[PDB]
Amino acid sequence: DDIYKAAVEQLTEEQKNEFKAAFDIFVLGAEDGCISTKELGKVMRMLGQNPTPEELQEMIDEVDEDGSGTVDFDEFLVMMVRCMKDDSKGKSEEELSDLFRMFDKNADGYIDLDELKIMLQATGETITEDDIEELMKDGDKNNDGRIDYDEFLEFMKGVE
């Protein structure tokens, strides 16, 4: 969703207008005003490829932000921009160890919230408290107050 929404916001206005037009084309005559498994499969047939039902479910689950089981415009942009794989080309294991070490400056084996916050402060961008909390949750899985190396590895999916 991270790279997806980033690419979405990177779209231009004319592109988003074409996306809205294509959405109206896909939901043309629909009954829920959104693209569900039925409408997505209909579009896939209209194209040529055939999609597995479980695959259609898993895809709609990888684009929704609401919880409707259907694809709306806000999710149409994600479903129409996810093509480029932004989170590919994972950094080398040595580079990952370097990342963990420099995030664990005091040499302890854990990236406490203080290190993450000072890092966000150092980056220079205006860090919002909500951003801090969301990143802290994304890293620290068990919510013990620190990001270990396994939780840090988990922090690298959707990141590049």
Out of 42, 85, 117, 143, the only residue in the binding site for another protein (CB under 8 A) is 85
Positive or negative: CA dihedral 75, 79, 83, 87: positive
Q: Is residue 28 involved in binding another protein (CB under 8 A)?
A: no
Tell me whether residue 11 or residue 119 sits nearer to Ca ion (CB atom).
Answer: 119
Q: Which of residues 11-70 bind Ca ion (CB under 5 A)?
A: 64, 66, 68, 70
Residues whose CB is less than 8 angstroms from the CB of residue 104 and which lie 6 or more positions away in sequence, other chains included: 110, 111, 115
CB atoms within 10 A of CB 32: 13
Q: Is residue 27 involved in binding another protein (CB under 8 A)?
A: no
Binding-site ranges for another protein (CB under 8 A): 1-6, 8-12, 14-15, 18, 22, 25, 47, 49, 51, 55, 58-59, 62, 80-85, 88, 97-103, 107, 109-110, 119-120, 122-125, 127-128, 130-131, 134-135, 138, 142, 148-151, 157-160
